[model samples]
Target: KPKLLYCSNGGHFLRILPDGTVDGTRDRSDQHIQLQLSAESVGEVYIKSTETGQYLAMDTDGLLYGSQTPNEECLFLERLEENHYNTYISKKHAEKGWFVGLKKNGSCKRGPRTHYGQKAILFLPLPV
Candidate 1:
């Protein structure tokens, strides 16, 4: 089954625009924001955007971006949260404590730690 990472706080789907910027946008009509997962050698996985053919990535500076091809920077470890949801933490940036999270404006960013109060902490799986 196909699924999407729905932002509970933003009320939008996590998407990588054509320009490689990450945002939470409403409407999955084009399924541009749709993501697919593939396991890595370490048992972690990469999240790839269906629309832009890019993978969710984070730079060494902890800035979130989308890559045209898969790489270590695009690998993430899925952690089960207390709420039974999953948090996608950067496998390559684990030492830096970077996690894929959202900002108040629905923009994608990397957080050093999960902030329970922040809407970015919670992401739900919505079936397409």
Candidate 2:
């Protein structure tokens, strides 16, 4: 099934914009933006944009870029927080707690600038 990543902190939906860009949008009017989440292991997953057919990826600097061939950068460890929100941290960067985050305005935040239990790092997975 597909899903909508609703940012609990940013009040927007995690979206892929233009080509090779990832951000948060307040609307989900386009069907092309639906995200398909795939589990890699227990508490580990990756996001794949159905339209783009690419996995959601991040760089070492914490940029949210999308990729098709390499799944290495897309893996995230899904953790359920005490507030019941989900935090998606890069599995390779998990030691540093590099989480997927969006600022209050719904802009993507670099992984290093974010932290655990923060609004910018919390998201709710919803079915589409």
Candidate 3:
């Protein structure tokens, strides 16, 4: 079965639209946000949006964006959090403590280390 990363705080799944924008507003399986995980030799993974065919990338300024092609900035280190959930930390921005986080309005952003609250962590397999 296919899966998506569901944000507990946002109550939505990570989604990338056809316009290369990221959001978290999906609910049902048919309207759910789907992603493709491709393993990298370095142990990182590239998360590509199944809907838009774009890679999740983070800019140097800590802005989260989507890229049409996979790049170094798109690689993420899937870390197991203390709560047993997973957090997608930017492999290229590790020094800056950048993690994929969702705002209250369901927008995507690169948050700091202190922002790894419930909104920053994600669960796999999605909740039925």
- Which candidate wins on TM-score? 2
Query: Which scores greater on TM-score, model 1 or model 3?
Result: 1
Report the lDDT tens digits of candidate 1 across residue range 14-33: 88878888778877674667
Candidates in order have lDDT scores of 0.75, 0.83, 0.72
Ranking by lDDT: 2, 1, 3
Candidate number achieving the greatest lDDT relative to the actual structure: 2
Write down the RMSD of all candidates, one decimal each.
2.2, 1.5, 2.6
lDDT by residue for model 3 over 60-117, one digit each (tens)?
8887788999989899888766666678878887877788877666777655632555
Model 2, span 1-128: residue lDDT tens: 99888898768888876577788888777654688888888898988888878788889887888787556899998888776678899888888888888888878889899788788888888887
- Candidate 3 ranges with C-alpha deviation above 4 Å: 29-32, 82-84, 112-114
Of models 1 and 3, which has the larger lDDT?
1
How far residue 112's Cα lies from its native spot in candidate 3, in Å, is: 4.2
Lowest lDDT 10-mer window, candidate 2? 25-34
Per-prediction TM-score: 0.85, 0.92, 0.82
